[PDB]
Amino acid sequence: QVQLVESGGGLVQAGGSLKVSCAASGRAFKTYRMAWFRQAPGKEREFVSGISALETTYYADSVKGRFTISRDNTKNTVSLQMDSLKPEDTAVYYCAARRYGGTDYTTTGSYDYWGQGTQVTVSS
Amino acid sequence: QVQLVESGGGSVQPGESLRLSCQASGRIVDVNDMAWYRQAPGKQRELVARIARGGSTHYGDSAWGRFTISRDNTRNTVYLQMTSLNVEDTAVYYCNGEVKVGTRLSPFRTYWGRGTQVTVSSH
Amino acid sequence: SAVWGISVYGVFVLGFYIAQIVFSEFNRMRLSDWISLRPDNWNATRVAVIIAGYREDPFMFKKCLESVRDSEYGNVARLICVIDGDEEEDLKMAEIYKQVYNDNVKKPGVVLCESENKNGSTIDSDVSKNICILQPHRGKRESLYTGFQLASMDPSVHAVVLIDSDTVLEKNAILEVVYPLSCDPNIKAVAGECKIWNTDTILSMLVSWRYFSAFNVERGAQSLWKTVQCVGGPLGAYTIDIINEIKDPWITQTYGDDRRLTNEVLMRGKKIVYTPFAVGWSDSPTNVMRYIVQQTRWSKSWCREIWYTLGSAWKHGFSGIYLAFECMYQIMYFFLVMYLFSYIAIKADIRAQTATVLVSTLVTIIKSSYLALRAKNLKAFYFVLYTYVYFFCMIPARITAMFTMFDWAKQFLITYMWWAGVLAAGVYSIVDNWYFDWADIQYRFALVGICSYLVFVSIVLVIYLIGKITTWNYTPLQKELIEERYLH
Ligand SMILES: CCCCCCCCCCCCCCCCCC(=O)OC[C@H](COP(=O)(O)OCCN)OC(=O)CCCCCCCCCCCCCCCCC
Ligand SMILES: CC(C)CCC[C@@H](C)[C@H]1CC[C@H]2[C@@H]3CC=C4C[C@@H](OC(=O)CCC(=O)O)CC[C@]4(C)[C@H]3CC[C@]12C
Ligand SMILES: CC(=O)N[C@@H]1[C@@H](O[C@@H]2O[C@H](C(=O)O)[C@@H](O)[C@H](O)[C@H]2O)[C@H](O)[C@@H](CO)O[C@H]1O
Ligand SMILES: O=c1ccn([C@@H]2O[C@H](COP(=O)(O)OP(=O)(O)O)[C@@H](O)[C@H]2O)c(=O)[nH]1
Ligand SMILES: [Mn+2]
Ligand SMILES: [Mn+2]
């Protein structure tokens, strides 16, 4: 099993940059597909970005050219670098992991292991 | 038990033919090779010609252009043709054969003949 | 560094194989040009046929002798049969000779090479009759030495055709080995094609196609430049003069025979060709252990003799550059395969393991396609399985030869070590990449590729099983031999 703890994020004005990294303690951080999801006060959880175990990166329609995801299997940390945090980024970011799955990788039920989330705020 | 008939030679003048024919015995499974050895009243016996079932020929030290050997394997016979004889051809000619008797499993046995006297003299 | 390692391997293998194919085709065209313009019923080179055997199968020995006797060459001097005999058990071969040939067995008390008088007159008096000699057991080289002495004491033999005691010659095999000797006054040796006839087992079939490749492609490519490295044991021809010159150094220097003779001809700066129109049917081992033993011996000889071809290349001028490059290629191919396997095993990446497997399969399929086109046979595609044999029967043999040359026991300890290492590497890769992801396109590629490869290999093996059930795999000579042995 894999236990995920978030780190990073906070209060950044509209236009700045930020980084959120989830650290996953587990047997094999080599075969675990990782993803990030955002929960907004006026919305629900949704897929924003993710990276497979073979370093294939998937990005959401709204954040296709905004964020950058990477993973480090030595220190067991997957990081998301956000640039130009405009509104609608004021959300709690959760890091999710999954070893076995199918073609559906966007629905929250696909990923088995979930984190506690880190809050990110944006002020205009 | 096989025998070689031998056609027979005789006394001939220098410079003619002999036509020495050697015919084998009866019950015979195979004949591999047959040769015409010669024994002079001088120094031991020697080889004149040897012929195989496949037509290969092995001649002696004086047969290269004078004596020829023919098989005609229809009746397991051998023929030796003599040309340009000289006074040194007086000898006894022996027929040599390799014959099977019993069956295919029987070994090839070498057999010799009684021989024929050939004398070349101007008398 | 994975894509470069696989692309370089694929180019380095396939380009050299294609160059060898082109050179082989050019050599075959030249030999066919030589065969044309030859007068009908040609026999000019008087030939002495030499057989050396040691406790041979009676049936195969009889077939070999009868194939020699049925040959359609009209200028054969005699058959010289030399046996490491002098014993009671080795008299069965003499009895077979007597029942196919003359009763002209000779049993001297000494071997010719060990005597102050090495002339053959001490054992031979009639140079006309086919002769059988029962030597004391000393080895293949000594029996070949006696054959050379018996053939060279008749001042009419021009060439010697060396064959084994198990080869079934075709009716024109003798004619097609001694003809190239007459086409170039620098050609002193000729190698004939050896074909495997007992393709009733999977190992035997793969080895038969390996022999087809190694003779009709490698040896043809070598023979285009007239620098054939090894004259095949089952069917070779040597001029009598080169035998006279190179016999003594070859006998006063184990399994390097027919490779050290070729080497002596090469250091003398003389040319050697290979003709594909002379076929001799020999057999192949049907056991993996005996195949590994034979390949260990062959690799010992190869690594012992490769250092002489590399120092004698300059005698050939600029045609020896191909010889040197071939030696360097044979040296580097083993190291490339070892390093590539080690990298793919240690790194343990699925998208690279699958890529390597598929590239190797494609290369072997192309090779087998050419083999089927040349042989006019659909069974040549069985060669796609030979990549297993080389990996599991040839690498341990080469490593054992290397670790014996400069250092069960040694023979059968590196084989199990190599197999255990391969199995451990495979298990490590599977255990390190245990996960399923159908969303990833790369995982889809890897899984689909590996499943397709297993399906293809299973289909080929099932085809082989169906062919073996119906006895469709058997060569026509194999069916004839089965019927004849049943008749006996
Ligand atoms: C002719 C062409 C045909 C083309 C189509 C062929 C079919 C295409 C595929 C069709 C769909 C098949 C999908 C796979 C079915 C088997 C997997 C499965 O059903 O179970 C999933 C399994 C994990 O499941 P589980 O742990 O039980 O999770 C709990 C819920 N059951 O997941 C697994 O355990 C997967 C384990 C397999 C991983 C293999 C990774 C290795 C990939 C190749 C590398 C090895 C190369 C060889 C070794 C070389 C060594 C040098
Ligand atoms: C029980 C399981 C875990 C064992 C796993 C088996 C693999 C570790 C072995 C079996 C077949 C082997 C392959 C068989 C043949 C070759 C050819 C070998 O060298 C060649 O490519 C030369 C042949 C050619 O030119 O195509 C490269 C490694 C490879 C792919 C081998 C890689 C290792 C393989 C996949
Ligand atoms: C077919 C061929 O020519 N193989 C070469 C080897 O020749 C073999 O030599 C042994 C022997 O002990 O004399 C015989 O048992 C085999 O029938 C021969 O094929 C040769 O030894 C080897 C040395 O480099 O290379 C082979 O290509
Ligand atoms: O010490 C020996 C060993 C083998 N031979 C003969 O040389 C050939 C070698 O073939 P082998 O039996 O080793 O099997 P192969 O390598 O052809 O598969 C055979 O005709 C042997 O009878 C020999 O004369 N002396
Ligand atoms: Mn044998
Ligand atoms: Mn053999």
Residue numbers in the entry:
A (entry chain B): 1 to 124
B (entry chain C): 1 to 123
C (entry chain A): 38 to 290, 298 to 451, 472 to 552
Give me lines lifted from the publication on this model.
HA consists of alternating N-acetylglucosamine (GlcNAc) and glucuronic acid (GlcA) units and is synthesized and translocated across the plasma membrane by HA synthase (HAS), a membrane-embedded processive glycosyltransferase (GT). HAS transfers the UDP-activated glycosyl unit (the donor sugar) to the nonreducing end of the nascent HA polymer (the acceptor sugar). This reaction generates UDP and elongated HA as reaction products.
Binding of UDP-GlcA to GlcNAc-primed HAS generates an HA disaccharide with GlcA at the nonreducing end. First, exposure of WT CvHAS to both of its substrates resulted in a UDP–HA disaccharide-bound conformation, interpreted as a state directly after glycosyl transfer and before UDP release. The density at the acceptor site is consistent with GlcNAc, preceded by weaker density inside the catalytic pocket, assigned to GlcA. Because the UDP and HA disaccharide densities are not clearly separated, we cannot exclude the presence of an overlapping minor second state in which CvHAS is bound to UDP-GlcA and a GlcNAc monosaccharide primer (released from UDP-GlcNAc).
